[PDB]
Enzyme design. Sequence first.
Site, short mmCIF file in Angstrom:
data_model
loop_
_atom_site.label_atom_id
_atom_site.label_comp_id
_atom_site.label_asym_id
_atom_site.label_seq_id
_atom_site.Cartn_x
_atom_site.Cartn_y
_atom_site.Cartn_z
N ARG A 100 -2.13 -1.88 -13.98
CA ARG A 100 -0.71 -2.03 -13.73
C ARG A 100 0.14 -1.90 -14.99
O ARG A 100 1.37 -1.91 -14.87
CB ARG A 100 -0.40 -3.36 -13.03
N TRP A 122 -5.57 7.28 -11.65
CA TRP A 122 -6.78 7.84 -12.24
C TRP A 122 -7.84 6.80 -12.40
O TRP A 122 -7.58 5.58 -12.37
CB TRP A 122 -6.47 8.48 -13.59
C1 HEM Z 1 -2.94 4.80 -13.18
C2 HEM Z 1 -4.20 4.47 -13.25
C3 HEM Z 1 -4.75 3.32 -12.48
C4 HEM Z 1 -5.96 2.66 -12.87
C5 HEM Z 1 -6.82 2.98 -14.08
C6 HEM Z 1 -6.09 1.69 -11.74
C7 HEM Z 1 -7.20 0.78 -11.69
C8 HEM Z 1 -7.67 0.14 -10.44
C9 HEM Z 1 -9.05 -0.35 -10.23
C10 HEM Z 1 -10.25 -0.22 -11.13
C11 HEM Z 1 -9.08 -0.99 -8.92
C12 HEM Z 1 -10.25 -1.59 -8.23
C13 HEM Z 1 -10.59 -0.53 -7.18
C14 HEM Z 1 -11.92 -0.79 -6.52
O1 HEM Z 1 -12.72 -1.60 -7.05
O2 HEM Z 1 -12.20 -0.19 -5.48
C15 HEM Z 1 -7.70 -0.85 -8.43
C16 HEM Z 1 -7.30 -1.41 -7.18
C17 HEM Z 1 -5.94 -1.26 -6.70
N1 HEM Z 1 -4.97 -0.55 -7.29
FE1 HEM Z 1 -4.87 0.37 -9.14
N2 HEM Z 1 -5.14 1.67 -10.77
C18 HEM Z 1 -4.30 2.66 -11.22
C19 HEM Z 1 -3.13 3.15 -10.49
C20 HEM Z 1 -2.64 2.56 -9.25
C21 HEM Z 1 -1.41 3.01 -8.54
C22 HEM Z 1 -0.55 4.18 -8.92
C23 HEM Z 1 -1.31 2.05 -7.41
C24 HEM Z 1 -0.29 1.99 -6.33
C25 HEM Z 1 0.82 2.67 -6.49
C26 HEM Z 1 -2.44 1.12 -7.49
C27 HEM Z 1 -2.68 -0.02 -6.63
C28 HEM Z 1 -3.96 -0.69 -6.43
C29 HEM Z 1 -4.23 -1.44 -5.19
C30 HEM Z 1 -3.33 -1.76 -4.02
C31 HEM Z 1 -5.62 -1.84 -5.41
C32 HEM Z 1 -6.59 -2.65 -4.60
C33 HEM Z 1 -7.21 -1.68 -3.62
C34 HEM Z 1 -8.05 -2.56 -2.74
O3 HEM Z 1 -7.77 -3.80 -2.57
O4 HEM Z 1 -8.97 -1.95 -2.24
N3 HEM Z 1 -3.33 1.49 -8.55
N4 HEM Z 1 -6.82 -0.10 -9.30
C1 4KJ Z 2 -5.58 4.55 -6.34
O1 4KJ Z 2 -6.23 3.52 -7.14
N1 4KJ Z 2 -6.80 4.03 -8.41
C2 4KJ Z 2 -5.88 4.73 -9.29
C3 4KJ Z 2 -8.09 3.82 -8.77
N2 4KJ Z 2 -8.48 4.02 -10.04
N3 4KJ Z 2 -9.04 3.40 -7.91
C4 4KJ Z 2 -8.85 3.25 -6.55
C5 4KJ Z 2 -10.01 2.98 -5.62
C6 4KJ Z 2 -11.09 4.03 -5.89
C7 4KJ Z 2 -12.53 3.58 -5.56
N4 4KJ Z 2 -12.87 2.41 -6.36
C8 4KJ Z 2 -13.51 4.70 -5.90
O2 4KJ Z 2 -14.43 4.49 -6.71
O3 4KJ Z 2 -13.41 5.84 -5.41
#
Ligand code: HEM
Ligand code: 4KJ
Lengths: 407, 411
Positions: free
Chosen positions: A109, A278
Amino acid sequence: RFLKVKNWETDVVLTDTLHLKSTLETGCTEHICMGSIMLPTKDQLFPLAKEFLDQYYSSIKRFGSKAHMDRLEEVNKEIESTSTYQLKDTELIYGAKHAWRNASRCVGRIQWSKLQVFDARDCTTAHGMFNYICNHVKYATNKGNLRSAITIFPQRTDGKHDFRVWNSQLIRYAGYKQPDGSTLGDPANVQFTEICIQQGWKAPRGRFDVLPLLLQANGNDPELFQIPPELVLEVPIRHPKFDWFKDLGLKWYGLPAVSNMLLEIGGLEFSACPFSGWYMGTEIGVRDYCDNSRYNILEEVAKKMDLDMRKTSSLWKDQALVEINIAVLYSFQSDKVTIVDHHSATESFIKHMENEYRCRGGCPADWVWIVPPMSGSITPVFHQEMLNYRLTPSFEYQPDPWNTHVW
Amino acid sequence: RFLKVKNWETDVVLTDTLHLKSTLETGCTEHICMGSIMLPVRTKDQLFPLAKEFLDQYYSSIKRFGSKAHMDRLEEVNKEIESTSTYQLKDTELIYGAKHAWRNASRCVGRIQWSKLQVFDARDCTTAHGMFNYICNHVKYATNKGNLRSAITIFPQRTDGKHDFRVWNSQLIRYAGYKQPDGSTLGDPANVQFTEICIQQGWKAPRGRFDVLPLLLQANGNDPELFQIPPELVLEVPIRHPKFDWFKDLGLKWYGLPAVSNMLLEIGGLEFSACPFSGWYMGTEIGVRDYCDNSRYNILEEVAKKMDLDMRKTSSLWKDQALVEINIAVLYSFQSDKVTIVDHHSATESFIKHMENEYRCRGGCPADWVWIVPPMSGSITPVFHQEMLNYRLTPSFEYQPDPWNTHVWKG
Ligand code: HEM
Ligand SMILES: CON(C)C(=N)/N=C/CC[C@H](N)C(=O)O
Ligand code: HEM
Ligand SMILES: C[C@H](O)[C@H](O)[C@H]1CNc2nc(N)[nH]c(=O)c2N1
Ligand SMILES: C[C@H](O)[C@H](O)[C@H]1CNc2nc(N)[nH]c(=O)c2N1
Ligand SMILES: CON(C)C(=N)/N=C/CC[C@H](N)C(=O)O
Ligand SMILES: [Zn+2]
């Protein structure tokens, strides 16, 4: 009631006040902590609307201005009349940036305010949704220099007219059950993969088949579409020292794009709102490749490395884990597809938390999700106390549409 | 009403009813989860209920609930409380109590072992020297020449809060920490404060990287006293690596017996403020945390230098590579010297089996996921994928403040 969070490696103490603005419930009580559970009218709409607009006008230094008081009346009249209301573009953009800002499970974030918002509220058909999605994918991919984006389809009405992307991510690999008993491709997607096949997709029945998009407009039956392959950036996985790594035949896609969630802004529900950024390396190298219920490749990798697989205490799994993740990193880097390692990501998130503590009075953070699934304690987030709570605007889970949808 | 937890890897669903018998608070509310927060004079008034509940539990466990011996015991505890303000546990109730506090420790991954616990009853102890003798017996018993045995020693309970038995060390065996005039630290930086206290109390410090601290012991609310554990009782293991011959020349060792001594044991409302207990190490405790925390020995750089890793960018994963080698070395060294140790794969697998047993037999198992999941290789261990309910059951182990923060100095 103003709460402290301590970092135990730095002794930095932060005071949280933002939680008092907390809206929804956590699932915990004073008797029981549910921290590790994965899934824990006109009358309702106006408070929700007001609460949102109040924070919007506050954010632009216009709290209690006539422009504020006027919008509040205009929205109220629109609800009294139509039973819903429409967001101004500026509000929509604010609402999306902030839903990401509030996402307690997202380590990424620090980026929350560079989000490209694509307003698709004028979309009416699956084919239209398909056009919008391809455009998002190309925009976000940016030939490997990834840029964050969300595309927002029309808001829920009576809930019989929902827009939905049935995929769980825009781009994911197929999973097939075999006579064998084993699973080919990605076992996470077995069920969706059969719904596609049931819809009429011709599966190549390989290990890494990009799934077709399955799109539903205005509550209609959904329709298949292939993403133009020239739009699906993929990385072949090699190792910077193990020449045999390439023969494992692994690839992954560059663009993570969650597409099954629901965006709530000011009481309004946007049930199709795919967003993308990403990858952090561990998502692919640790979870997608090594989870026992995913590609599960540890066994095979360890063999190629000739490690002693006879007893757990050789740490052969752990050894293989590291190399695989070195390889994911090395490959994306070699091909210039944006990726972040867990050290850099977590360091960045700590600086983000500190930013939010002084600027906003806090930052909701779910420690269970934030700490990477490898090398936990050597990342600073491990040592960081975090308070988890729910703020709106938000991204929320929502049921898979196939259990719901009426055919 | 029943509560479900799911394992996301196996789809196994469990039903917890045990949380119903919780009353103590978590630190969470319906609006805030405090699940990652480290730390989130009793009168007759409170006491009898707490006593009753415990004895109702003890008596059900032994299949004697509602028995004459049950009812007579309640009546006798009742009378003792009103006459004396407190009461004494029978030997059997104490043993059952200390075991259940282990069973209910939601942060312990080792609880499969909960019923094999040696209880040493030191409730007749009156002096520091008496405490010292008791602790030596403990350490020699638990150590058993490398073949570790779990045990706990229970000194007399709190009376008015002015006569407390305390072990001032946080573990029975642990290394000194020395803050240098240049701002670096020699030895373990976790133990700098306690080390300074010892020195002030008269300890002559060897000032090395691995000096075994003296016991600082408090009986009956008196000023605490210093004692050297006899070295022949302190099992230690030199750390080498099966393939890296230079590893030994880092000069690392560790002690084999982990023995937490600064926690408070509560049984039927009574408070045992000195109750050191010990089992054996999971390897990641020493390999990941004691060696590799930035605030601890912090050996990652020195180790990785020796491995000639690419240290110029985090994305080489040089830290992760050196961490694994260090952990391999710890488990190799322990196994070669025949000192009991458990790896994190083995310990987490056993815990999942413990946990399911407990749902079936007990109705639940309070677990704190943040603590149970090992600080390396989280998701390749089955606990990572296991949903867990955390809640507080009694008997329990609890934190209590460090005694130098409360003690009234006598001189
Ligand atoms: C820009 C690079 C970004 C990185 C490196 C990043 C990183 C992550 C990571 C590592 C997770 C855990 C995902 C998993 O374990 O499956 C995550 C979950 C999440 N991210 Fe981010 N993120 C990024 C951008 C965003 C953007 C652009 C949004 C929304 C606009 C977002 C919203 C969320 C939400 C809602 C979750 C939880 C998904 C769930 O509960 O399954 N992410 N993100
Ligand atoms: C859209 O959320 N972002 C940016 C992210 N890095 N990961 C989102 C969920 C992806 C899932 N953990 C996967 O490995 O494909
Ligand atoms: C049999 C060998 C045992 C193993 C492998 C084991 C495993 C562990 C591990 C890895 C931790 C986390 C410690 C840390 O990260 O600081 C822990 C915590 C704990 N264990 Fe066990 N344990 C064992 C025996 C026991 C015994 C005999 C008791 C007491 C009867 C006990 C009660 C606890 C308590 C109260 C904590 C929490 C400590 C704290 O919060 O600082 N353990 N154990
Ligand atoms: C049971 C447990 O909550 C579950 O395995 C969680 C733990 N932490 C996670 N953390 C992330 N980042 N992603 C996940 O899918 C999970 N799964
Ligand atoms: C803030 C955070 O809760 C803290 O660093 C915890 C996390 N999990 C832990 N787990 C164990 N076993 N030991 C610990 O010391 C910690 N530390
Ligand atoms: C007393 O609990 N036991 C047996 C245990 N394995 N761990 C206790 C704490 C040890 C501490 N983490 C250390 O590394 O010294
Ligand atoms: Zn909680």
